[PDB]
Ligand binder design. Sequence first.
Ligand SMILES: CCCCCCOCCOCCNC(=O)c1ccc(C(=O)O)c(C2=C3CC=C(N4[C@@H]5CC[C@H]4COC5)C=C3Oc3cc(N4[C@@H]5CC[C@H]4COC5)ccc32)c1
Ligand SMILES: [Ca+2]
Ligand SMILES: [Ca+2]
Ligand SMILES: [Ca+2]
Ligand SMILES: [Ca+2]
Ligand SMILES: [Cl-]
Length: 462
Amino acid sequence: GTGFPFDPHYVEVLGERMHYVDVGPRDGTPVLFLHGNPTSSYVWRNIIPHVAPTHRCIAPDLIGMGKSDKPDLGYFFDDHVRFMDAFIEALGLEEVVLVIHDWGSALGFHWAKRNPERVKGIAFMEFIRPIPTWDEWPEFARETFQAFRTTDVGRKLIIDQNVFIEWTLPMAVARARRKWQKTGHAVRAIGRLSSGGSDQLTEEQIAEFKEAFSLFDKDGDGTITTKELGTVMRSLGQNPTEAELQDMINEVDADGNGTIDFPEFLTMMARKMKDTDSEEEIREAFRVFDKDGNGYISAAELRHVMTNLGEKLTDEEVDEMIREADIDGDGQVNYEEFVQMMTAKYLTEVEMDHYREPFLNPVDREPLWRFPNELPIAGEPANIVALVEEYMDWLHQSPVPKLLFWGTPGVLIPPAEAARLAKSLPNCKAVDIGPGLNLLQEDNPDLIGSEIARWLSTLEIS
Ligand SMILES: CCCCCCOCCOCCNC(=O)c1ccc(C(=O)O)c(C2=C3CC=C(N4[C@@H]5CC[C@H]4COC5)C=C3Oc3cc(N4[C@@H]5CC[C@H]4COC5)ccc32)c1
Ligand SMILES: [Ca+2]
Ligand SMILES: [Ca+2]
Ligand SMILES: [Ca+2]
Ligand SMILES: [Ca+2]
Ligand SMILES: [Cl-]
């Protein structure tokens, strides 16, 4: 679902105008959806239609974000508190049910603690809590977010280069697709080793092939040798000769040095060909995954090809790859599911353009940089850590009905953390949404929407 059909509404807030969705019946307790960084009310576009048939749904765009006004603010968390506090009063919301995500959940939890009699329920997912150590932060994103949290490299990355929109955001949905594509690329690379010229690749295409290259360059020295290619080719069951290995390398060895460096690998992976020969490569990769040739990639078959390509996947990681690929839910992966995994990103271009639209001007990207610099990680910043600790204490002692959504591996909320909270929060039901990183609304909106609407029917609301 890529559209945003909701009539735009605006309300005057501290001398600015804030945009919000307002759908559903007018009467009854309103359900307030709060988005986080770097999204907008667009993040709820596929959740709200499950709830709007029977409830008023209000989804603001944070100040400086979405379609809301963009004043010259520092956009600290306490800036957002001011505007969200005033937004709630401006709409005259006496009682609410909160549905909150990432920085929207800090907003909602902090507001609920201070107005506990005005909150009849809280549904939350991938929410802000104190991250005790950088060890609890996904390894693959540790370096980048540490770099985000500086005024020189972080601002150049986020503000000057729009990396948080163009890179972080499409990488914050889920993870299995990176592994499918890395191994599909390596399988197509094997084939290409065994039309006319090559494309010049974008910087985004080049990095996608960087992971695939690492599978062959076992020792990481930047070149693929006779012995490295033979190791790979060995595990796959296509066992060939040192003469075969050299001739294969020689066809791609532009500089004649006997090894394949990353630029030569790129030129092979950028070869031009008709679309139908591109399709034949993907059909051939599917047949490699589909060992018994019955038309479905089983979990056991996936384990074999992943090992034969040099991965060492836990059972949880295998299950994750299947479940992300399994559109029709039969526990296996047919050719159509394979194709989508290999050739599509988590967010369509139409979906990226909606997320991009508020931030086309670099001078408008301040909240994109300030937000990761506010994240409570390893005790910094200490005021944010203190504030979040206070509402987590409130949350542990409060009888408010709570609904927790979580995925694997998560980002803010690891599965083990979700387990802890599911047991220690009072009157809390927890729902496993399946695979996901931070944007769980882009992983399983139907379950989240369905479950929120069933949960609402049990509350003391009208
Ligand atoms: C509630 C919070 C919500 C949480 C949601 C997030 O949850 C997980 C999602 O993912 C986490 C984020 N990971 C990434 O964003 C992510 C993933 C892969 C890459 C990669 O380069 O391969 C990068 C990029 C990085 C990464 C690390 C850098 N370092 C090094 C050395 C210097 C610096 C300081 O330290 C060590 C510098 C980078 O420079 C980049 C410049 C550009 N560009 C654009 C335009 C020009 C320029 C060049 O080419 C296109 C594009 C990308 C990157 C970012
Ligand atoms: Ca090497
Ligand atoms: Ca070479
Ligand atoms: Ca099979
Ligand atoms: Ca299937
Ligand atoms: Cl953030």
